[PDB]
């Protein structure tokens, strides 16, 4: 219902739906936050439907923002400092992530940021804040935002022989921020081309399971649930993450993602998002299984 | 704000450290029942040039004893181990040479300019912080914290009169003394260029905003930098 | 005399009611009784202690908590937000004559005492203030944007007659208009008059502008702001940039300028302040109670206090015990000093957390921001040289150049947190050299030539080149920072996300445990509660100043010399004195953690351990074995010394048993205080005396 124009890519549709549902944000005993929002990146050739996903998400959801990696203002994805002649004094112009605070920020052309935005994205993605300290303004600005990135691989075509790290220019600290990576590659299949053309044409002619208003109401209702983690699901999460780390250890010496604790917390958030989708009181092992399935396929298709 | 009267006028200059004895009182020509306050000075004490004869006798004795050079070198930065030749160079900088005016009117600077390039953690900044304290006139500046106008001189509009007036930079504030430029390599090139006249000619020639003068900058530049 | 009453029932308005003599006297008596009879939950007479702590320091200002004023006296809490000026005046009088009962000579110190109300529950967002709140007590929060200087304002003014010697009697000055006499009663001359500047009574005045905090609601919108007036002792309670919490009376008056600006009868508003707190300085030494000091000093008696404090830093982070140790030493800090009155050296300790992604470095910085007072946080390109140090600007109303505080000046006695430090620009990153060592920021700009104080501990986080740390290279070979900036960091920390399945299981189980524990709804020692830790830190940084008298000079010198020798062959940089002074600062910090007034050998051993373990961490992975053996064997990895105490105990027991056949714990500790083995507690928690069948009891003292 949310992606009728999209042909195939069921795993990507599921991942972005879980991004909409999101995980539970938490605060430690020492007043330090734990991130609840997940972040999803979609790498693909310019000929594929990566922009279509972002456009559908931003058309659907309220409070969301669409932006390019390049800035259409002095402020970009993050804030910038500008004088105003009403006082000849410095103030902060807000960026896309702040405008998307408590919402979704769809970022097309994610690979082509400026250095200022690319560095400030490190704090915004994980700490959910932007800490500006310049002349005339000191401010820790809030960016409690889920990011839906779309990226272009180097040389346009996604080279399957190369790893995903070799395909894109995103640095390893940036890649660790994302909870899910998805790959869209333009296959030369005749039936797929005919299906894409048919879907576009018959949808365009049609205009004259659930409606988007119903999905909006259900999503807003579902996001009020805060699923707990059952003991069996705790054991499932820790077992699967131990398995993931030792599997990565089997090929850690070669160039690889080199998995971190952020992916454990991504697994936790994805299981919580599954429980939120079904409005469950607590996370169950089946939710953990689905979350690990999506995450693990992301690991494998990043490595290969 | 201070108010100095009669013979207290010109008893102190900018950059001096003083103890002021006076009467805290209102000026008597946002909010309503507010009056600005100032101190009517009746005693100035420079906390640190008129020497007593006893002090002059002590200084003559110090100049007369044979190892005064080594005594001064040991006295400079006594907490700093080693670096004795650099301390001797700092002694030469502190005492300085003799200014000379030649028959054609050209003047030669007596001040000694001393650069300390080298490795970090080597007490260069501490030697600068000693010289600022020890020189009769001494101004400490960070190179990265400085600007061309702020070093040499600034031209600014007087708010109460609309005229453009002159403001002394560090090299004017240190006239007749030492400028300690710490982390000297961190300055931008255009700002290091500004001090070229003041280092050699010991003047700051200004032509800005219709005011055109040649301030004096008879001072020694002690600089510290890293590789 | 005027008779006592039930207060809450009346036909008047509240202001009129509390203005009348009868209920005014009743309110006075009630507040007097409340001060002289209120008790803590444990039964401690609260306001006797608070008045004694006020009169000791001559603070002439008594802070009262609404949340127990409402508990004790209901009607006073009822009238207070409704008629605050009148009730606060009555409270001031009652508090004054309570204080002059407790300390009868205190009128020599001050003739008037102000009651300051705290924890007012009717908090208001700053933009949500309306006409409904006028002339009522409110509480708001915001960042101070502007402050006037402290100015003298007329309070009780006597006017000299314009034509003769007579002084016209006192007029009580208002905040609305300048009170005036009109004409003199001795001779009815009129119009202008002279203030008697000597007999007129003035009061301190300071007008501040506060606006909404940038991260609170201003999500691209412009923030709203209000003016506030601080009087008497409330001046200098805050500065620009302070996230204050302000209680005050929301007061309004006619303003012709606003009327002509809006074209309507619009009245200006201002907050007459009654209490100023700060939302970062949640605890202060001026607010610590005797019970807080008692429980702090009881905690210091525990021999596990170092481990408890280390375990108490960022308790939701598994592992990283070396990081927690270094951060504790930096959080407590060393002792600044100036030997000879001519040579300054800093007391503050700087830390750098380098390592690969997903290792809680930024999380550590955020924890330090939360726990420590006067802390600030900045990141990478978000920071600038000028904003970090200090900035020169046209003043908004004067339009003359004015210097203003940057990051390291606003944190002049706190912690500046710089996340993603490797990603700053060089011109931004080199600006902190003077602040990091000489602890001043010297500015020569636009006619301003001055040096500001920046006595700030810098804690930074960074990634190596390429994001991932490679053990094949030294720290210097993959950090990309230079020697002048590396050497200014007292503690270097390296964190690596290397695979180890058992450790991964433990870490993952702890992370899942944290996630389920903190639902909205390596430690082995248990932490302190974080409130207790904040009180402990703020007590230790002010009430304790560790002195240095002996630290085994030859040991430290030998250690430093061969540390320099080994470093010459490899890739981290002990510049000559900074590492020696880092060890001195860390020993002082460990003494401060234990609340010691004097540094001991254990603190020196801890400092040496921290320095050497950090240095070993900076080596290549192949070189760590040889380096670790070199320093561990000779240079004082002083783990324990149980054998000497074992044979001392056995010797004393052998002599005692021989004497008996033809209080032993006292006999043991006598020889232990004679020989330099004084930390006997390790011997009692070690198995060496236990398998020799010895045991201890604090009561019986037999062994
Ligand atoms: N020979 C020395 N004797 C005494 N103290 C020294 C010596 N060398 C360095 N120090 C100390 O090392 C610390 C740093 O000294 P500093 O003055 O910054 O040297 P520096 O070379 O200017 N540092 P840098 O700005 O990085 O070049 C201070 O506490 C000095 O007292
Ligand atoms: N040992 C640990 N215990 C608990 N949480 C951890 C641990 N290690 C990492 N994390 C979590 O990992 C997440 C990322 O923390 P963060 O401080 O941003 O890592 P980082 O060191 O800054 N990585 P980077 O910003 O790329 O250099 C947070 O949610 C942390 O709680
Ligand atoms: Mg220096
Ligand atoms: Mg980080
Ligand atoms: Zn008269």
Using the Cβ of C502 and the Cβ atoms of chain A, whether some distance falls under 8 Å is answered with no
Of C449, C484, C577, the CB nearest to B170: C449
Which residue of chain C comes nearest to B132, CA vs CA? C342
Q: Do C206 and B37 meet the contact criterion of CB atoms below 8 Å apart? A: no
Mutate to test the pocket of ligand 2, among A37, A143, A245, A262 (most ligand atoms within 8 A of CB): A262
C93 — phi, psi (to 5°)?
-65, -45
Nearest to C544 by CA among C281, C296, C283: C296
CA dist., res. C222 & res. A89, Å (int) = 14
Q: Which residue's alpha carbon is at the smallest distance from atom 23 of ligand 1?
A: B121
Q: Residue B210 half-sphere exposure, CB side, CA atoms within 13 Å? A: 4
Dihedral Cα C223, C226, C230, C236, nearest 10 deg: 10
Q: How far is CA C338 from CA A4, A144, B129, in A?
A: 74, 47, 13
- With CB atoms and an 8 Å threshold, state whether A134 touches C214: no
Q: How far is CA A179 from CA A19, A35, A174, B19, C221, in A?
A: 9, 11, 11, 65, 31
Burial of C68 (0-12, 13-18, 19+ CB in 10 A): middle
Spacing of C-alpha B124 from chain mean position: 19
SS3 call for C103: coil
- Residue bearing tokens 């923002």: A65
Mutate to test the pocket of ligand 2, among A31, A124, A172, A261 (most ligand atoms within 8 A of CB): A261
Mutate to test the pocket of ligand 1, among B126, B130, B182, B226 (most ligand atoms within 8 A of CB): B126
SS3 call for A9: coil
Q: How far is CA C450 from CA B2, B186, C390, C401, C409, in A?
A: 20, 18, 11, 13, 13
Pocket lining: C434 vs ligand 1, CB cutoff 6 Å? no
Say how many Å lie between the CA of residue A230 and the centre of ligand 2. Answer: 24
C690 — phi, psi (to 5°)?
-75, -45
- Residue bearing tokens 């205009």: A207
Q: Do C304 and C515 meet the contact criterion of CB atoms below 8 Å apart? A: no
Rounded to the nearest 5 percent, the helix, strand and coil shares of chain B are 30, 30, 40
Angle C326-C332-C338 (CA atoms, 0-180°, nearest 5)?
Answer: 110
Q: Do C253 and C268 meet the contact criterion of CB atoms below 8 Å apart? A: yes
- With CB atoms and an 8 Å threshold, state whether A122 touches C420: yes
Q: Residue C33 half-sphere exposure, CB side, CA atoms within 13 Å? A: 9
Of B25, B32, B186, the CB nearest to C430: B186
Question: From its phi and psi, is residue B131 left (phi > 0), alpha (psi between -120 and 50) or beta?
Answer: alpha
CA dist., res. A111 & res. A152, Å (int) = 7
Q: How far is CA A175 from CA A3, A68, A172, in A?
A: 26, 18, 5
C362 is in an annotated binding site: yes
Q: How far apart are the first and last CA of chain A?
A: 31
Residues 6+ apart with CB under 8 A from C266: C255, C258, C259
Question: From its phi and psi, is residue B84 left (phi > 0), alpha (psi between -120 and 50) or beta?
Answer: alpha
Q: Do C336 and C620 meet the contact criterion of CB atoms below 8 Å apart? A: no
CA dist., res. C469 & res. C494, Å (int) = 9
Q: How many Cβ atoms sit within 10 Å of the Cβ of residue B197? A: 16
Q: How far is CA A206 from CA A199, C231, C679, in A?
A: 10, 73, 86
CA dist., res. A289 & res. A286, Å (int) = 5
Residues forming beta bridges with residue B215, ordered by sequence position: B204
CA dist., res. C666 & res. C674, Å (int) = 12
Nearest to A35 by CA among A149, A172, A128: A128
Provide the shortest C-alpha distance from residue C531 to chain A (in Å).
9
Farthest CA pair distance, chain B: 69
SS3 call for A88: coil
Which residue of chain B comes nearest to C339, CA vs CA? B79
Q: How many Cβ atoms sit within 10 Å of the Cβ of residue C419? A: 28
Q: Do C609 and C587 meet the contact criterion of CB atoms below 8 Å apart? A: no
- Residue bearing tokens 């259900």: A218
Say how many Å lie between the CA of residue C438 and the centre of ligand 1. Answer: 9
Q: Do C407 and C378 meet the contact criterion of CB atoms below 8 Å apart? A: yes
CA dist., res. A69 & res. A61, Å (int) = 20
Strand pairing class (C194-195; A40-44)? unpaired
Rounded to the nearest 5 percent, the helix, strand and coil shares of chain A are 45, 20, 40
CA dist., res. C77 & res. C55, Å (int) = 26
Residues 6+ apart with CB under 8 A from A279: A221, A222, A225
Nearest to C406 by CA among C376, C371, C368: C376
Q: How far is CA C214 from CA A63, A73, A95, C412, in A?
A: 20, 20, 14, 22
Pocket lining: C361 vs ligand 2, CB cutoff 6 Å? yes
CA dist., res. A183 & res. A45, Å (int) = 9
DSSP 8-state assignment for residue B153 = E
CA dist., res. C15 & res. C21, Å (int) = 12
Say how many Å lie between the CA of residue C361 and the centre of ligand 4. Answer: 5
SS3 call for C520: coil
Pocket lining: C511 vs ligand 2, CB cutoff 6 Å? yes
Sign for the CA dihedral angle at B63, B66, B70, B75 comes to negative
Residues 6+ apart with CB under 8 A from C488: B120, C350, C433, C436, C437, C578
Angle C316-C320-C324 (CA atoms, 0-180°, nearest 5)?
Answer: 80
Residues 6+ apart with CB under 8 A from C562: C630, C635
Q: What's B89-100 look like in SS3?
A: HHHHHHHCCCCE
- Name where chain A breaks: residue before each gap, C-N > 2.5 Å: 208
Pocket lining: C121 vs ligand 2, CB cutoff 6 Å? no
Of B123, B151, B159, the CB nearest to C399: B159
Mutate to test the pocket of ligand 1, among C347, C439, C575, C577 (most ligand atoms within 8 A of CB): C577
- With CB atoms and an 8 Å threshold, state whether A229 touches C516: yes
Of C430, C447, C451, the CB nearest to B156: C447
CA dist., res. C163 & res. A206, Å (int) = 97
Burial of A135 (0-12, 13-18, 19+ CB in 10 A): buried
Say how many Å lie between the CA of residue B126 and the centre of ligand 1. Answer: 6
Q: Do A137 and C394 meet the contact criterion of CB atoms below 8 Å apart? A: no
Pocket lining: C576 vs ligand 1, CB cutoff 6 Å? yes
Q: Is there an interface between A and B (3+ Cβ pairs < 8 A)?
A: no
Nearest to C437 by CA among B77, B129, B222, B125: B125
DSSP 8-state assignment for residue C128 = G
Provide the shortest C-alpha distance from residue B14 to chain C (in Å).
11
CA dist., res. C590 & res. C600, Å (int) = 9
Residues 6+ apart with CB under 8 A from B165: B155, B156, B157, B158, B211
H or E segment and range at residue C567: helix C553-568
Query: For residue A174, which ligand has an atom nearest its CA?
Result: 2
H helical segments located in C453-529: 475-479, 483-486, 501-517
DSSP 8-state assignment for residue C382 = G
What determination technique applies here?
cryo-EM
Residues 6+ apart with CB under 8 A from C624: C616
CA dist., res. C449 & res. C430, Å (int) = 20
- Tell me the helices (H) and strands (E) count for chain B, helix number first: 8, 13
Pocket lining: B154 vs ligand 1, CB cutoff 6 Å? no
Farthest CA pair distance, chain A: 63
Q: At what angle do helices C553-568 and C576-593 cross, to 10 degrees?
A: 130
Q: How many Cβ atoms sit within 10 Å of the Cβ of residue B25? A: 15
What DSSP assignment string belongs to C181-210? --B-SSS--BS--EE-TTTSEEEEEEEEEE
Pocket lining: B109 vs ligand 1, CB cutoff 6 Å? no
H or E segment and range at residue B24: strand B18-26
Q: Do C89 and C274 meet the contact criterion of CB atoms below 8 Å apart? A: no
Q: Do C352 and C485 meet the contact criterion of CB atoms below 8 Å apart? A: no
Which residue of chain C comes nearest to B150, CA vs CA? C445
SS3 call for A39: coil
Say how many Å lie between the CA of residue C343 and the centre of ligand 1. Answer: 11
Pocket lining: B113 vs ligand 1, CB cutoff 6 Å? no
Nearest to B142 by CA among B178, B172, B177, B184: B184
Say how many Å lie between the CA of residue B92 and the centre of ligand 3. Answer: 22
Subunits touching A (CB < 8 Å, at least 3 pairs)?
C
Show the tokens assigned to C562: 């061969």
Judging contacts by C-beta atoms under 8 Å, the chain B residues touching residue C431 are 144-145, 186
Subunits touching B (CB < 8 Å, at least 3 pairs)?
C
Q: What's C149-177 look like in SS3?
A: CCEEEEEEEEEECCCCCCEEEEEECCCCC
Nearest to C689 by CA among C674, C701, C700, C703: C703
Nearest to C444 by CA among B29, A73, B132, B157: B132
Q: Do C352 and C491 meet the contact criterion of CB atoms below 8 Å apart? A: yes
Residues 6+ apart with CB under 8 A from A91: A81, A82, A83, A84, A136, A137
Residues 6+ apart with CB under 8 A from C172: C155, C156, C179
Which residue of chain B comes nearest to C172, CA vs CA? B33
What DSSP assignment string belongs to C448-474? EEEEEE---EEEEEE--TTSS--TTS-
Say how many Å lie between the CA of residue A241 and the centre of ligand 2. Answer: 16
């Amino acid at each position: 219902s949310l992606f009728p124009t999209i042909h195939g890519n069921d795993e990507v549709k599921r991942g972005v739906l879980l991004m909409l549902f999101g995980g539970v944000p938490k605060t430690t005993g020492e007043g330090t936050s734990l991130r609840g929002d997940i972040n999803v990146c979609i790498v693909g050739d310019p000929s594929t439907a990566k922009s279509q996903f972002l456009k559908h998400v931003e058309e659907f959801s309220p409070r969301a923002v669409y932006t390019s990696g390049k800035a259409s203002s002095a402020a970009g994805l993050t804030a910038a400092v500008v004088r105003d002649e009403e006082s000849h004094e410095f103030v902060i112009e807000a960026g896309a992530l702040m405008l998307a605070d408590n919402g979704v920020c769809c970022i097309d052309e994610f690979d082509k940021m400026d250095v200022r935005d690319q560095v400030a994205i490190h704090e915004a993605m994980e700490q959910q804040t932007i800490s500006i300290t310049k002349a005339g303004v000191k401010a820790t600005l809030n960016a409690r935002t889920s990011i839906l990135a779309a990226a272009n691989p180097i040389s346009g075509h996604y080279d399957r022989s190369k790893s995903l790290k070799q395909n894109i220019n995103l640095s390893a600290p940036i890649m660790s921020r994302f909870d899910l990576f998805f790959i869209l590659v333009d296959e030369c299949n005749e039936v797929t081309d005919y299906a894409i053309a048919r879907r576009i044409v018959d949808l365009h002619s049609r205009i004259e399971v659930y409606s988007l208003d119903d999905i909006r109401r259900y999503l807003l209702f579902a996001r009020q649930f805060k699923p707990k983690i059952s003991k069996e699901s705790e054991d499932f999460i820790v077992e699967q993450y131990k398995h993931l780390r030792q599997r990565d250890g089997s090929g850690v010496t070669k160039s690889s993602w080199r998995i971190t604790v952020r992916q454990l917390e991504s697994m936790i958030r994805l299981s919580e998002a599954m429980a939120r989708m079904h409005c469950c009181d607590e996370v169950q092992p089946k939710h953990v299984k689905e979350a690990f399935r999506l995450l693990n396929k992301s690991i494998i298709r990043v490595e290969t | 704000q201070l108010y100095c009267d009669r013979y207290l006028c010109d008893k102190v200059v900018p950059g001096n450290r003083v103890t002021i004895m006076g009467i805290y009182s209102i000026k008597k020509f946002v909010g309503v029942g507010i009056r600005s306050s100032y101190i009517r000075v009746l005693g100035i004490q420079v906390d640190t040039g008129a020497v007593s004869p006893q002090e002059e006798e002590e200084f003559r004795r110090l100049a007369a004893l044979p190892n005064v050079y080594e005594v001064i070198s040991k006295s400079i930065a006594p907490s700093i181990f080693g670096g004795t030749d650099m301390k001797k160079a700092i002694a030469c900088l502190l005492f300085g040479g003799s200014r000379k005016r030649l028959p054609d009117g050209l003047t030669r600077r007596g001040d000694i300019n001393l650069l300390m390039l080298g490795d970090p953690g080597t007490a260069k900044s501490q030697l600068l912080k000693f010289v600022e304290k020890c020189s009769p006139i001494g101004v400490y500046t960070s190179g990265k914290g400085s600007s061309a106008a702020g070093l040499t001189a600034s031209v600014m509009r007087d708010p109460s009169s609309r005229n453009f007036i002159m403001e002394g930079g560090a090299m004017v504030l240190a006239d007749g003394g030492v400028v300690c430029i710490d982390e000297f390599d961190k300055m931008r090139e255009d700002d290091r260029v500004a001090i070229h006249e003041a280092m050699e000619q010991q003047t700051i020639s200004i032509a800005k905003a219709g005011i055109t003068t040649t301030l004096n900058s008879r001072c020694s530049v002690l600089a510290a930098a890293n590789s | 005399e005027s008779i006592e009453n039930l207060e809450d029932l009346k036909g008047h308005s509240v202001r009129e009611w509390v203005s009348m003599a009868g209920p005014r006297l009743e309110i006075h008596h009630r507040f007097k009784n409340f001060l002289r009879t209120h008790v803590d939950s444990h039964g401690h007479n609260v306001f006797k202690e608070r008045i004694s702590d006020m009169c000791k320091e001559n603070r002439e200002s008594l802070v009262v908590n609404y949340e127990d004023l409402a508990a004790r006296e209901h009607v006073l809490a009822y009238f207070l937000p409704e008629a605050p000026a009148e009730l606060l005046q009555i409270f001031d009088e009652a508090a004054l004559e309570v204080v002059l009962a407790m300390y009868p000579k205190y009128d020599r110190i001050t003739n008037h005492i102000h009651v300051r109300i705290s924890h007012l529950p009717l908090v208001e967002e700053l933009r949500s203030l309306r006409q409904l709140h006028l002339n009522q007590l409110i509480r708001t929060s915001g960042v101070v944007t502007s402050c006037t200087g402290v100015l003298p304002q007329l309070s009780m003014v006597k006017y000299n007659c314009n034509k003769c010697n007579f002084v016209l009697g006192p007029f009580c000055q208002s905040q609305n208009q300048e009170v005036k006499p009109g004409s003199c009663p001795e001779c009815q001359s009129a119009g202008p008059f002279e203030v008697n500047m000597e007999e007129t009574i003035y009061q301190n005045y300071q007008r501040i502008r506060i606006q909404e905090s940038p991260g609170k609601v201003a999500a691209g919108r412009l923030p709203r702001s209000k003016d506030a007036i601080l009087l008497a002792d409330l001046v200098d309670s805050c500065k620009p940039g302070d996230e204050i919490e302000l209680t005050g009376i929301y007061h309004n008056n006619y303003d012709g300028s606003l009327n002509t600006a809006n074209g309507f009868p619009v009245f200006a508003t201002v907050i007459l302040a009654n209490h100023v707190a700060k939302k970062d300085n949640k605890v202060a030494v001026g607010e610590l109670t005797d019970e807080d000091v008692k429980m702090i000093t009881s905690l210091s008696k525990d021999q596990q206090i170092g481990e408890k404090i280390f375990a108490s830093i960022a308790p939701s982070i598994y592992g990283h015990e070396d990081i927690k140790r270094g951060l504790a030493l930096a959080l407590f800090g060393g002792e600044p000093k100036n030997p000879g009155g001519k040579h300054k050296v800093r007391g503050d300790i700087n830390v750098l957390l380098c390592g690969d992604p997903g290792t809680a470095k930024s999380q550590f910085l955020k924890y330090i921001e939360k726990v420590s007072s006067r802390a600030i946080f900045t990141t990478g390109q978000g920071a600038s040289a000028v904003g970090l140090t200090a900035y020169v600007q046209r003043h908004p109303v004067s339009r003359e150049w004015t210097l203003e505080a940057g990051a390291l000046v606003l944190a002049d006695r706190g912690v500046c947190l710089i996340d993603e430090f490797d990603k700053m620009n060089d011109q931004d990153r080199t600006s902190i050299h003077e602040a990091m060592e000489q602890q001043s920021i010297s500015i020569s700009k636009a006619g301003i030539v001055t040096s500001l104080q920046a006595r700030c501990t810098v804690i930074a986080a960074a990634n190596p080149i390429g994001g991932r740390y490679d053990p094949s290279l030294t720290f210097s070979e993959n950090v990309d920072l230079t020697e002048p900036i590396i050497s200014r960091f007292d503690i270097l920390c390296v964190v690596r996300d290397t695979v180890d399945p058992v450790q991964d299981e433990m870490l993952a189980r702890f992370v899942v445990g944290s996630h389920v524990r903190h639902h909205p709804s390596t430690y082995g020692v248990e932490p302190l509660p974080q409130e207790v830790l904040k009180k402990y830190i703020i007590y230790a940084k002010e009430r304790v100043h560790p002195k240095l008298n002996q630290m085994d000079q030859d040991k430290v010198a030998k250690m430093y010399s061969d540390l320099r020798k080994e470093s010459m062959a490899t890739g981290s940089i002990p510049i000559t004195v900074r590492h020696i002074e880092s060890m001195i600062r860390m020993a002082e910090a460990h003494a401060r953690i234990h609340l010691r007034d004097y540094v001991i050998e254990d603190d020196v051993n801890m400092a040496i351990r921290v320095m050497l373990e950090s240095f070993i961490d900076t080596q290549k992975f192949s070189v760590m074995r040889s380096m670790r053996k070199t320093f561990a064997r000779y240079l004082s990895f002083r783990r324990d010394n149980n054998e000497l105490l074992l044979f001392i105990l056995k010797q004393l027991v052998a002599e005692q048993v021989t004497y008996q056949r033809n209080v032993p714990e006292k006999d043991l500790v006598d020889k232990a205080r004679q020989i330099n083995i004084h930390n006997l507690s390790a011997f009692y928690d070690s198995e060496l005396f236990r398998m020799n069948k010895f045991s201890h009891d604090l009561k019986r003292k037999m062994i």
